[PDB]
Structure 1
Amino acid sequence: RDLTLLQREERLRDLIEKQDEVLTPVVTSKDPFKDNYTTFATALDSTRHQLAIKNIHITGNRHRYLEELQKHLAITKSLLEEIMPSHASENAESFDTIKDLENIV
């Protein structure tokens, strides 16, 4: 028993020291890498918060163009609120079940 348990805690400490040597460098490098990398990530994502445009007519400042487009999408959503029945999805999902019924018939 005792000579087999000793040989198990022997190999446990060997398997630990072979990791500890390599974990300690990585841990001493942790947060000074993390916070540089997070500063880089948020700054890099700001370069993608910027939709591309081709041959749209636009008048002055891009916020002032969005302000006037907003005043008209504030009529388009309000008109889908004047047009969407409580079953618009069930109707829109039936589309191809109707065609497979016809294909079977």
Structure 2
Amino acid sequence: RDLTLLQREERLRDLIEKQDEVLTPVVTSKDPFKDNYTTFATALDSTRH
């Protein structure tokens, strides 16, 4: 039982570590993008009517 549970936890850790490495840069640049994009889209939308 102990060996089997340890093997599964190790696999889970490996998977989480690989994801953290790639998600951290995207979350940090999110808020400036969303705000710049929304302002841009609203400005563009006012020229079509």
Q: TM-score, normalised by structure 1?
A: 0.44
**Structure 1: segments with no counterpart, 5+ residues:** 49-105
Number of aligned residue pairs: 48
Structure 1 or 2: more helix by fraction: 2
| Structure-1 residue corresponding to 2:47 | 47
RMSD: 0.6
TM superposition shift of 1:7? 0.8
TM superposition shift of 1:2? 1.0
Q: Which has the larger radius of gyration?
A: 1
TM superposition shift of 1:46? 0.6
* Larger RCO (alpha carbons 8 Å, 6+ apart): 1
Map Cα deviations across residues 48-93 of structure 1 (whole Å, 9 max, x no partner).
1xxxxxxxxxxxxxxxxxxxxxxxxxxxxxxxxxxxxxxxxxxxxx
Structure 1 or 2: more strand by fraction: 1
TM superposition shift of 1:4? 1.1
Percent identity, please. 100
Q: TM-score, normalised by structure 2?
A: 0.91
Q: Which runs of 4+ in 1 moved over 4 A?
A: none
